[PDB]
Design a protein around this ligand. Structure first.
Ligand SMILES: OC[C@H]1O[C@@H](n2cnc3c2N=CNC[C@H]3O)C[C@@H]1O
Ligand SMILES: [Ca+2]
Ligand SMILES: [Ca+2]
Ligand SMILES: [Zn+2]
Length: 331
């Protein structure tokens, strides 16, 4: 169940992996961009996983059409606004929206810092309209190499007072986290919080690298952490959050079945693991499905599902006052 007396969060949620299919059609028409399909029914298999993808890199290609229609900064503002609307429609009280401004800007060569500003604007408008609380996480898309990631870093730094955290996402095996030592040194000097996609396609060594070298306070996925008990202990003792995305892990073939997902194991070891969506539009599911379908299939008890719900706020990049206000309201 979702406990309606506790805040509902989603802290691993890619804005640019959540571009509505109707919005892809609308923007393609507005900009006269040729699309692979002309109706929702025929567009879906090009923009959404229909069963599973064979690996992480294949899954990543499903986001491409959404960002290929972003031909202006106003289009970026629209998708940011619609992302807050989607969060509101799912009963979320608090979201952290992560986005790769370089990935969003790539197709039409938009100014990368302008994409950051447009996302900030659209999220501000959406929060004002719907009342969802939100913070922004900038992503460096490792897939495009260290120099492209520096361009994204510079764009986010030009808006650093509006960005709460930095993340590394994309092709984990092709671009190990060790390559981004300098990018994260600069992020920590800027005072940003740190999360890192790690231990999804690669092993526990990638998680250790994210913690010890990149300064990660949370780990995106971290599925392979169960292979190292010392790592499990370190996560629990140091209160390093785990951002679990059950359906995503099925759809990237990171786990073959939810019955073998490590989320239950994390919670039994005292790790602050939370339930999240990842890429709602691409996956065809949102947070309600993760709680009511994916989490029971992953073997979690009712109490464990509640603990994951609590952990999402506990690991949020929010002040004690902000966390208290959300808890006091919903109680
Ligand atoms: O926000 C868009 C960026 O994030 C990547 N990205 C989007 N969803 C995921 C990503 N990366 C790694 N693991 C799978 C899943 O969690 C794609 C793009 O670079
Ligand atoms: Ca509110
Ligand atoms: Ca009280
Ligand atoms: Zn992700």
């Amino acid at each position: 169940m979702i406990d309606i007396t506790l805040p509902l969060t989603d802290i691993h949620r890619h804005l640019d992996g959540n571009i509505r299919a109707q919005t892809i059609l609308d923007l393609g028409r507005q900009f006269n961009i040729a699309l692979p399909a002309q109706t929702l029914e025929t567009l879906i298999p090009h923009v959404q996983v229909t069963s599973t993808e064979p690996d992480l890199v294949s899954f990543l290609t499903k986001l491409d059409w959404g960002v290929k229609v972003l031909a202006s900064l106003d289009a970026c503002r629209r998708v940011a606004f619609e992302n807050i609307e989607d969060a509101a429609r799912n009963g979320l009280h608090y979201v952290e929206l992560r986005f790769s401004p370089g990935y969003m800007a790539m197709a039409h060569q938009l100014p990368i810092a302008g994409v950051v500003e447009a996302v900030i604007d659209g999220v501000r408008d959406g929060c004002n309209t719907f009342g969802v609380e939100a913070r922004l996480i900038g992503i460096m898309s490792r897939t495009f190499g260290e120099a492209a990631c520096l361009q994204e870093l510079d764009a986010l730094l030009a808006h650093r007072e509006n960005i709460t955290a930095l993340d590394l996402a994309g092709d984990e095996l092709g671009f190990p986290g060790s390559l981004f030592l300098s990018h994260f040194n600069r992020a920590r000097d800027a005072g940003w919080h740190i999360t890192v996609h790690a231990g999804e396609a690669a092993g526990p060594e990638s998680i250790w690298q994210a913690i010890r070298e990149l300064g990660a306070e949370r780990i995106g996925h971290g599925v392979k952490a169960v292979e190292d008990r010392a790592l499990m202990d370190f996560l629990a003792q140091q209160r390093i959050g785990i951002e679990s995305c059950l359906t995503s892990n099925i759809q990237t073939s990171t786990v073959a079945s939810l019955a073998d997902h490590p989320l239950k194991t994390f919670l039994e070891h005292g790790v602050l693991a939370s339930l999240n969506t990842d890429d709602p539009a691409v996956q065809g599911v949102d947070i309600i499905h993760e709680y009511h379908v994916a989490a029971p299939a992953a073997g979690l008890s009712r109490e464990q599902i509640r603990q994951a719900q609590i952990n999402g706020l506990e690991i949020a990049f929010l002040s004690d006052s902000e966390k208290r206000a959300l808890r006091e309201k919903v109680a």
